[PDB]
Design a protein around this ligand. Structure first.
Ligand code: JYH
Ligand code: JYH
Lengths: 239, 10, 239, 11
C-alpha cells in the first residue's frame, strides 16, 4: 500500500509548513466585504486598486519569504534567486488568489479577509483577465488540492532551471528534482484511487504560464491607468 | 533592484 | 494480454503515424535557401512573409488533418473541435517549427524544404519574438524527442479540457488522460535510464503556452504592420 | 465569418 520515503517526507513537510506559514488558509480568515463599485464593472476603481496593489505588494513579500524557506534556494547566488523569483512571481500570485475562490459566492479572499466578487476583482485591476483567472479558479476546485500540494506546486514553479540568464541552472534542476518526486509520491498517498492525478495537477503550471504571460501585459497597461506609479516591488518583479 | 537585494540578503 | 497495455500501444501508434504522415522529418527534407534579407534584420520582408504565411497555412491544414486522426476527436462537438483547434493551433505551430531547427547553421526548415536563418525568420514575421522561439528550440534538442513523443505532446496540447468556451470540458478532459499515460509509458520505454524525463518533456508545454501567448500578441502587431490581410485560415485560427 | 476551417473539418 506504500513504502518508506523518509527524507522525502521530511522535505515535503518543510514545504507544507513553509507554505501555510506564509499563506493563511481560506477557512482561517476573518472575511469582510466592501460596497465600492460592487454593482457594475468599470475601467479601474482607484479605491479598490489602492488596497489591491498593497495586498499584492504584501503577498509578494510572503512569496519571497516562502522561497527562502525552500531548501537550497538560499544556496543559489543572489542573481539566480532574483531570476527565479522574477519569473515565477506572477505565476504564484495567480495560484494563491485562485485557491481563495469561493464557488458559491463567486468571490476571492485576500490575507486580510477582504473578499471581492468577480466584478470587484475586475475593477481592482483584473480587466479583461477577470473571466480567465476566475475560470482557472473553478478548474482547481475539482482537484481538491491541499496546502501540501499547493506548496509543492508553487515550489516546482519557482525552482525551474529553464529560466533565462541563470548562472547555475543545473544546481537549480537538482533542487527541483526531489520536489517533483515528492509531489508524485504525496499524491499517490493522499489518493489511492484516481491515479492520473500527478500529471493533471502538474501541468496546471502550464495553465499558470498562459495567464502569467497575458498577466504581464495587463501590468503594463495598468501603469497607463494609475494615479501615480507602480509599487516599487511590483515593478522590480515585472521588468 | 533595491528591494529584492535587501529582502534576499536578509 | 493485459488490456490497458494493449489499448495504449494502439493509441501510441495511431498518434505517431498521424504525426509522421502529417509532418515530414528534418532528415527526410530536401533543404534549400534564399537570399532575401538574410544578412541584416528589418521590420518586415514582404517577400518572406508571403512565403512563410503560405507554408504556415499549409501546416495548419496539416495540423487539422492530424486532429481528425486523434482517437475520439471527431467524437467531440463541432464547436469544441473548432475551439480546440483555434486554441492549440499556435502551440503546435511553435512546436512543429522548433523540431525543424538546425543548431550548426542556426536555421529552421519548413515542409517544402525552405531553410531560413534566425534573421530571415525575424524578417518573415517573428519580429521581437524571434530569439524566444529559437531559445526554446535549443532547449528541445537535449531531449531528442521522436515522432511519438512530439506527436503525443501535440495531442496533449490539442486535447486540453481547460480551454475556454468548451461545451463538454469533462469529455475532452477524460480524453486527454489516456494520452498522458501513453506519454509516460513511452518515455519510460525509451529512456529507462533517465527516470524523471516524463515531467521534463511533459512540461515543455509550459514553454509552448508562454510563447503562444506572446505569439498571439505578436500576430496582432503584425496585423497592422502588413500591407494586406493575413491568409484567411490564419485569420480564423487567431480569432 | 470565415468558412474555411469547417470545410477542412468536414474533409
Ligand atoms: O493573499 C493575498 O492577500 C493575496 C493573494 C494573491 C494576490 N495576487 C495578485 O496580486 C495577483 C493575482 C493575479 C493577477 C493576475 C494578473 C495580473 C496581476 C497583477 C499583478 C501586479 C499588479 C497588477 C496586476 C495579478 C495579481 C494578492 C494578494
Ligand atoms: O513545416 C511547415 O510547413 C511549418 C512548420 C511550422 C510553422 N510554424 C509557424 O507558422 C509558426 C511558428 C511559430 C510562431 C510563433 C509566433 C507567431 C507565429 C505566427 C503564426 C501565424 C502568423 C504569424 C506569426 C508563429 C508561426 C509553419 C510552417
Amino acid at each position: 500500500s506504500y513504502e518508506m520515503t523518509a527524507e522525502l517526507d521530511d522535505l515535503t513537510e518543510k514545504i507544507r509548513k513553509a507554505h501555510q506559514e506564509t499563506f493563511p488558509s481560506l477557512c482561517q480568515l476573518g472575511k469582510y466585504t466592501t460596497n465600492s463599485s460592487a454593482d457594475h464593472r468599470v475601467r479601474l476603481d482607484l479605491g479598490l486598486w489602492d488596497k489591491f496593489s498593497e495586498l499584492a505588494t504584501k503577498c509578494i513579500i510572503k512569496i519571497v519569504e516562502f522561497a527562502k524557506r525552500l531548501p537550497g534556494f538560499t544556496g543559489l547566488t543572489i542573481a539566480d534567486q532574483i531570476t527565479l523569483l522574477k519569473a515565477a512571481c506572477l505565476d504564484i500570485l495567480i495560484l494563491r488568489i485562485c485557491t481563495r475562490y469561493t464557488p458559491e459566492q463567486d468571490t476571492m479572499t485576500f490575507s486580510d479577509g477582504l473578499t471581492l466578487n468577480r466584478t470587484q476583482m475586475h475593477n481592482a485591476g483584473f480587466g479583461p483577465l477577470t473571466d480567465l483567472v476566475f475560470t482557472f479558479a473553478n478548474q482547481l476546485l475539482p482537484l481538491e488540492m491541499d496546502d501540501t500540494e499547493t506548496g509543492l506546486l508553487s515550489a516546482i514553479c519557482l525552482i525551474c532551471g529553464d529560466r533565462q540568464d541563470l548562472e547555475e541552472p543545473t544546481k537549480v534542476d537538482k533542487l527541483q528534482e526531489p520536489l517533483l518526486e515528492a509531489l508524485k509520491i504525496y499524491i499517490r498517498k493522499r489518493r489511492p484511487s484516481k491515479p492520473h492525478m500527478f500529471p493533471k495537477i502538474l501541468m496546471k503550471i502550464t495553465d499558470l504560464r498562459s495567464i502569467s504571460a497575458k498577466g504581464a501585459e495587463r501590468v503594463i497597461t495598468l501603469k497607463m491607468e494609475i494615479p501615480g506609479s507602480m509599487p516599487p516591488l511590483i515593478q522590480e518583479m515585472m521588468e | 533592484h533595491k528591494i529584492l537585494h535587501r529582502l534576499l540578503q536578509e
